[PDB]
Design a protein around this ligand. Structure first.
Ligand code: ADP
Length: 481
């Protein structure tokens, strides 16, 4: 039933989107805002359908009056809210469900103040008595952002969603928009889809009942702390956070869920920035949160390395079972030449464990990886041989010698020797742990795919998450070989 809802909202949004190019997200967000009692600020140059998409949204509702107004510096509350005879509000802001106000940052202090009470109190001072405004969606537009310490910032910071728009970029889209016979002022929404007053009011109550899971909160709180520590990060007030949380709830509700999901958190990318520099910072931070923490990605990778560590540890604990017998090569040469095993060892770079781990280059080393090519020439021509300690870092020079028993022995600064062994020809402890992790990964991936079907999230983000989960899965599958 709420799953028929996700179907309906999607179908509703689809129709509202007809004839509009490169504005999909913007329409879904304004719909989400309109259905959740939030407001949205549209930033961009003139003639890019900012007003149009605002007028479009009145067609989401059966009974919905729209109010449009362009702010001038000489604009008075009489023009915006109605002139008093007590006040004549018919055809003005005080009785419209969708209000669009263009060129917002030039509203005077008198308008500014009565707007702030309009957004907060959903009330209006009608001379004598105060009356509740039916305003469901407010949308404000401008080509610029308000001044640094402006009066208007209080208004800006009271408008949850921020969208930065531009002229159509795709050549094909330009042509389609250019030749579109779509009457832009006609109702494109089928009667059945339009939301009723009875529905609107019920949903307002139900959105508040959507739960906020522990992991979801932890992520939000993590980001709040993260932003705080970064000096460039925009200041996000508690007011902003609370209003952002309702949008998150609304997203979930209209996506057929009873709980805010980690995917809903992407929407914060449309709430937390106030300028250009802060937009980039927000996007990066949320991206890091989404690809790293939201589906336990980095947490599973830190578990993975812990297992791979144990695997190596068990590999060197069973390194008595193996040594490495270098085969003598005869012929006619000046040195006692040596040879690697014909095809037994053919790995381009092979790693060798040591029976007695040694302190080499101020660290204890359990395994040394050689470029097989470099080990060849040293076994033949002698000289000096390098090898990356514990597989990592630079190829360090080594005190290596061919043993009488035909083994390879590394020495430390105490001249302590250690025989080198090749890895085993998968232990039960590792198989158990690595299967638990794979199960956990599958459960994570399952959760993501079962929730990525979310109207209010742009496709590109979902791509990045899916990739980040594939990365972990690939790393674990390579670990079980
Ligand atoms: N991205 C777009 N998609 C569809 N139509 C557009 C787009 N950009 C501009 N238009 C056209 O421009 C007009 C709407 O512009 P308008 O609402 O005045 O924009 P703004 O409010 O940003 O000045 C319509 O006639 C519409 O067909």
């Amino acid at each position: 039933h709420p799953h028929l809802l996700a179907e309906r909202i999607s179908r509703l949004s689809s129709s509202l989107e007809k004839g509009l190019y490169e504005r999909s997200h913007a329409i879904r967000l304004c719909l989400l805002a309109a259905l959740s009692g939030e407001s949205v600020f549209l930033l961009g140059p003139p003639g890019i359908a900012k007003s149009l998409i605002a007028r479009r949204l009145k067609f989401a509702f059966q009974n919905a009056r729209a109010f449009e107004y362009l702010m001038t510096r000489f604009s008075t509350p009489e023009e915006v809210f109605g002139p008093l005879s007590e006040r004549l509000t018919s055809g003005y802001l005080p009785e419209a469900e969708i209000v669009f106000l263009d060129e917002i940052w030039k509203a005077g202090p008198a308008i500014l103040n009565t707007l702030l009470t309009a957004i907060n109190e959903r009330q209006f001072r009608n001379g004598a008595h105060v009356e509740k405004i039916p305003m469901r969606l407010l949308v404000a537009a401008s080509n610029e952002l308000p001044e640094a310490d402006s009066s208007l910032e209080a208004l800006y910071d009271r408008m949850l969603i921020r969208l930065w728009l531009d002229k159509v970029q795709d050549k094909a889209n330009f042509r389609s928009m250019l030749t579109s016979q779509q009457d832009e002022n006609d109702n494109p929404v089928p009667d059945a889809l339009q939301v009723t007053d009875e529905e609107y009011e019920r949903w307002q109550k139900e959105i508040g009942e959507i739960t906020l899971p522990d992991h979801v909160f932890e992520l939000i709180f993590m980001l709040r702390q993260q932003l705080d520590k970064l000096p460039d990060a925009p200041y996000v007030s508690d007011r902003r956070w609370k209003k952002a949380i309702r949008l998150l709830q609304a997203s979930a509700f209209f996506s057929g869920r009873s709980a805010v999901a980690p995917v809903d958190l992407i929407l914060l990318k449309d709430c937390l920035w106030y300028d250009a520099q802060s937009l980039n910072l927000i996007q990066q931070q949320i991206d890091v949160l989404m690809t790293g923490h939201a589906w336990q990605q980095q947490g599973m990778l830190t578990r993975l390395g812990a297992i791979v560590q144990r695997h190596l540890q068990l590999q060197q604990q069973q390194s008595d079972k193996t040594a490495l017998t270098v085969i003598r090569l005869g012929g006619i040469f000046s040195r006692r030449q040596q040879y690697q095993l014909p095809v037994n060892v053919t790995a381009s770079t092979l790693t060798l464990l040591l029976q007695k781990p040694l302190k080499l280059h101020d660290m204890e080393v359990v395994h040394i990886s050689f470029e097989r090519s470099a080990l060849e020439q040293w076994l033949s021509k002698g000289g000096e041989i390098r090898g990356k300690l514990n597989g990592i870092g630079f190829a360090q020079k080594l005190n290596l010698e061919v043993d009488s028993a035909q083994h390879l022995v590394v020495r430390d600064v105490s001249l302590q020797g250690s025989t080198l062994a090749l890895p085993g020809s998968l232990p039960g402890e590792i198989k158990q742990q690595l299967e638990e992790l794979e199960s956990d990964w599958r459960k994570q991936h399952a959760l993501f795919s079962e929730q990525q079907k979310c109207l209010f999230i742009p496709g590109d983000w979902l791509g990045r998450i899916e990739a980040s989960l594939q990365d972990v899965g690939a790393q674990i599958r390579q670990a079980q070989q």
